Structures are given as C-alpha cells and as structure tokens.
Amino acid sequence: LDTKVSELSHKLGSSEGSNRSLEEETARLRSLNQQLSSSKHELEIQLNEAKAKVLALDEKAQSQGDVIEQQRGRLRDMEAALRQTEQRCADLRDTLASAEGRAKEA
Amino acid sequence: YELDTKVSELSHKLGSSEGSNRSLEEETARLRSLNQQLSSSKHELEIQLNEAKAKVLALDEKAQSQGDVIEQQRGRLRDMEAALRQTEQRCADLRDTLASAEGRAKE
Amino acid sequence: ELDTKVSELSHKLGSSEGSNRSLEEETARLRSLNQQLSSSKHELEIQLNEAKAKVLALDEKAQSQGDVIEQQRGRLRDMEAALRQTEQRCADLRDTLASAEGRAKEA
Amino acid sequence: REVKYELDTKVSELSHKLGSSEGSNRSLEEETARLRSLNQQLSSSKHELEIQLNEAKAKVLALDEKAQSQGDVIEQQRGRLRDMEAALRQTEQRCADLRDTLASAEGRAKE
C-alpha cells in the first residue's frame, strides 16, 4: 500500500505540474486571440474605407474619360467648321475680285 | 483501513487531475487553431488593404491628369468658339459686300 | 481483489468528474459565443435589408436620370437644327437686303 | 465476513456514483454538441451575410457615384438648353427685324 501511495503521489505531481503550464498557455492564447480579433475588426474598418475610396475614384476616372472623349469630338468638329468658314471667306474674296473685273470691262 | 482510504483518495485525485489535463490539452489545441485562423484573416486583410491603398494612389494620379486634359480642352473649345464667331462675322461682311455688288451689276 | 476494484472505481470517478467540470466550462463559453454570433447576425440582417432597399432607390434614380439625359440630348439636337435653319433664313434676308441697297445706290 | 459487507457497500456506492457521473457526462456532451452545432450554423450565416452586405454596400456606393455624375450632366444640359432657347429667340428676332427693314427698303425703291 505504501508503494501505491508513492506511485500515485508521483503521477499526481506530474499531472498537476503539466496542468499549471497548460492553464498558463490557455490564458496566453485567449489573450493573443482577443488582440488578433481586435486587429481584424480594425483592418476591416480601414479596408471598407479604402474600398469606398477606390469606387469613388473609379467613377470619377470613368466620367472624366467620357468628358475628354466628348470634348475631343467637339474640338474635331470645331476645327472642321473653322476650316470651312475660312474657306468660304477666301472664296467670297475671289468672287468679289472676279465681279470687280467683270464690271471694269465697259 | 486508514492506508486503504489514502490510496482511494489519491486514485480519485489522480483521475480528476488526468481529466483536467485531457480537457486542457483539447482547449489548447482549439485555441491554437483559432489563433492561426485569426492570424491568417489579419494577414489577408493587410494584403487587401495594401492593394486598395495602392489602387487609390494610381486612381488619384490618373484623375489629376484627366482633370488637366479636361480644363485644357475647355480652354481650347472657348478659343475655337471665339475664332468661329469672328470668322463667321468676316464671312457675313463679305457676303453683304458681294450681295451689294451683285445688285449693282443687275441694275 | 475488492480493494483493487475500489481503487479502480475511485480513479474512474475522479476522471469522470474532471471531464464533467470541463463540459460545464465548455457549455458556458459556447452559450456566450452563440449570443455574440446571434447578435452579429441580427446586426448584419438589419444592415443588409437597408442596403438592398437603398440599391432599389438608387437603381430607380439612375434609370430616371438616364431618361432625362437622353430627352435633353434629343432636345439639344432639335434646338441646334432650329438655330441652323433660323440663321439660314437670316442670311437669306441679309442677302436680299444687301441686293436692294446696291440696286437703290446705282439708281 | 463483516468487513466484506463494508467493502461490498463501497464498491456498490462507487459503482452507482460512477454510472451517474458517466450519465451526466453523456447529457453534458449532448448540450456541448447541440451548442457547437448552433454555433457552426450562426457562424456560417454571419460569414454569408458579410459577403452579401459587402456586395450590396459596393453597389450602393457605385450607384450614389453614378447618380451624382448624372445630376451634373442634367444641370450642364439644362444650362446649355437655356442658352440655346436664348440664341433661338434672338435669331428669330433678328429675322423679324430684317423682314421689316427689307419691306421698308422695297417700299422706298417702289416710290
């Protein structure tokens, strides 16, 4: 019975020593988990803000691109209208000079 | 009898200690697993944030350049509207002089 | 013999008890996690319903705005046309007037 | 055999205490497994709602952004329509004035 008491005390000591270490580790892990869970929540807030800014910038860039192309088209049409109006001027000048020449003959 | 009660007391206390150990080992494994899942979500969100922040800078840069083009086209459009208004006015004056000479030639 | 059975039972009892306290410990944390998850779920449900509602209202507004834009574009082209034609009538009256002025001058 | 009765009672007492403990353990394991299941279901719903919410929130921002840009176009077009109405009103008025001046010149030329 004396040998049994010794064997059990011995097994209990080993088990309890292991237990105190495991209780420390559970406490350590619960703490790290709380910290990671907080960082995760924080990164989610920051990501949502950054993703929001991307969408706003995407819409601005797409709208700006449309404006540029609309203005490009309008500039082309204006260049054409100006070239044609100046050409009508030049033609009127020549027709006037020709009518003056016709009239001179008398 | 007093020695028999000690063995029974130690056996019971050993069983309780072992049961606590079996449980603590399971909980440590449960917590370690959760920790690497949380650690992975954190690392993932960091990658995604860095990419989103990068995309914002690229879009800010593009939006600023596009904004410059828009205003330099607006300025050019204004100058073209002006040139056209003035040229059309010179045309209209030439048309009046030509129409007048046509009328004089007719009579 | 019977004393070894007593030792065997006491050890098994302690282990069973220890396991039981571990489950009591577990149930409690599970009840807590459940309450937290249930609350996040309720919150997300509210937010989703609101966001889905806002999507419908924005889709409706975007579609109506698109109609206006196209109606205005159609009206702009009809006004451009009317202006082009009216200016052409002007130019023709301006030529007729300049012609009459020239005819009067020679007489 | 008086000691055997005292030892026999212990075995009996401990056996019944073990069975009862073993039984309580099976009930507690059912509650842990009932709660673990509900937790998994709730955790899954949460993850699902987060995906859906992120998508819906994204769509809201894109639509808000589009509606603001469309509103700018509408107002730019309204301004341009007003300027065109004015140009047209003025051109038609110049026409009417040229018609009157022409009719006058025709009348003077006749006399």
Numbering used by the authors:
A (entry chain F): 9 to 114
B (entry chain E): 7 to 113
C (entry chain A): 8 to 114
D (entry chain D): 3 to 113
Quote the study on this structure.
Centrioles have proximal-distal polarity and a 9-fold radial symmetry imparted by a likewise symmetrical central scaffold, the cartwheel. The spindle assembly abnormal protein 6 (SAS-6) self-assembles into 9-fold radially symmetric ring-shaped oligomers that stack via an unknown mechanism to form the cartwheel. SAS-6 proteins comprise a globular “head” domain at their N-terminus followed by a long coiled coil that mediates stable protein homo-dimerization (Keller et al., 2014), and a disordered C-terminal extension. The characteristic shape of the SAS-6 ring led to the proposal that the protein head domains comprise the central “hub” of the centriolar cartwheel, with SAS-6 coiled coils forming the cartwheel “spokes” (Cottee et al., 2015; Kitagawa et al., 2011; van Breugel et al., 2011; van Breugel et al., 2014; Yoshiba et al., 2019).
